[PDB]
Copies of this chain bind each other. A is one copy, B any other.
């Protein structure tokens, strides 16, 4: 009959299965930008760039020159002399932007008057080079590609999930990202999405995850770990401490408010995370004692 004790109380609810997962970083094929040629032409310059550097934003990649183009921009040129009604000249200018002449150039042809030489092309978005090293003098064709850039503001980690435990995930907080390379502050997490593709090896769905890269502290192909938390159909819960056995016997403390205790019988369904859930034995609201201590 002591009372240097602590009170506990039975509760209904689910558990929380921990689970760490292997994750490999990735570049979202969405936050990228490519620069393509308006139409065939030839090249010039090409700066001190390799397949992957750091462009600051809108900056030169290479000058280039185009034949054919000129043929008409000169034909047109004479009309401003041979009194060809405005509508005529205009009709050929659109017939040029058509083929694909930069608008800001045409104003410059019309103003500076001197036919349009070569015209450099600048990188659209800040980012990181990928593909491109081609240089000097090359013959190209229409909308053919010339180079790519990679954005880094958002990033991709793709953990490999078991279908069996798939649909138990429906909120971004179940996830807890972590990285060996960068402990640091946070690993905040934009949005999550699940490619319903069943990697036929182990029944595994690729689980895409756009992560906030601002401080740019991450490259790709790194090592990334995913602490996921799953749950369970709710069951009668009790703190583990307050449970005891050692053999076929399994059960603990009933405490009806009269401060009087009693041996009640419970069969643990499963245990996890320092607390246990009884398949059967107690009642929704019943009170039990954890950390207690008293005599025979």
Contact status A232-B167, CB under 8 Å: yes
- Whether A261 is near chain B, meaning CB under 8 Å from some CB there, is no
- Whether A203 is near chain B, meaning CB under 8 Å from some CB there, is yes
Q: How many of chain A's residues touch chain B, expressed as a range? A: 20 to 34
- Whether A211 is near chain B, meaning CB under 8 Å from some CB there, is no
Interface hits, A227-262 → B, CB 8 Å: 230, 232-233, 235
Contact status B194-A163, CB under 8 Å: no
Determine the distance from Cα of A230 to Cα of B166 in the docked complex, in whole angstroms: 11
Measured CB to CB, the nearest residue on chain B to A268 is B196
Residues in B with CB closer than 8 Å to A232 are: 166-167
- Whether A164 is near chain B, meaning CB under 8 Å from some CB there, is yes
- Cβ-neighbour of A270 out of B198, B230, B271 (below 8 A): B198
Determine the distance from Cα of A271 to Cα of B167 in the docked complex, in whole angstroms: 11
Residues in B with CB closer than 8 Å to A166 are: 17, 232, 270
Determine the distance from Cα of A197 to Cα of B232 in the docked complex, in whole angstroms: 17
Measured CB to CB, the nearest residue on chain B to A270 is B196
Measured CB to CB, the nearest residue on chain B to A278 is B196
Measured CB to CB, the nearest residue on chain B to A14 is B167
Tallying the copies of this chain within the complex gives 2
Contact status A203-B164, CB under 8 Å: no
- Whether A158 is near chain B, meaning CB under 8 Å from some CB there, is no
Determine the distance from Cα of A168 to Cα of B271 in the docked complex, in whole angstroms: 15
Contact status B163-A272, CB under 8 Å: yes
Nearest-neighbour CB distance to chain B for A167, whole angstroms, equals: 5
Determine the distance from Cα of A197 to Cα of B271 in the docked complex, in whole angstroms: 7
Measured CB to CB, the nearest residue on chain B to A233 is B167
- Cβ-neighbour of A271 out of B19, B196, B269, B276 (below 8 A): B196
- Whether A296 is near chain B, meaning CB under 8 Å from some CB there, is no
Interface hits, A270-296 → B, CB 8 Å: 270-272, 276
- Whether A98 is near chain B, meaning CB under 8 Å from some CB there, is no
Name 24 interchain pairs, CB-CB below 8 A, sorted by A: A17-B163, A17-B164, A17-B166, A17-B203, A19-B164, A19-B203, A163-B270, A163-B272, A164-B165, A164-B168, A165-B165, A166-B232, A167-B232, A167-B270, A194-B269, A194-B270, A196-B268, A196-B269, A196-B271, A197-B271, A198-B271, A198-B272, A203-B272, A205-B270
In the A-B complex, the 4 residue pairs with the smallest Cβ-Cβ separation, listed nearest first, are A17-B164, A196-B270, A167-B232, A164-B230
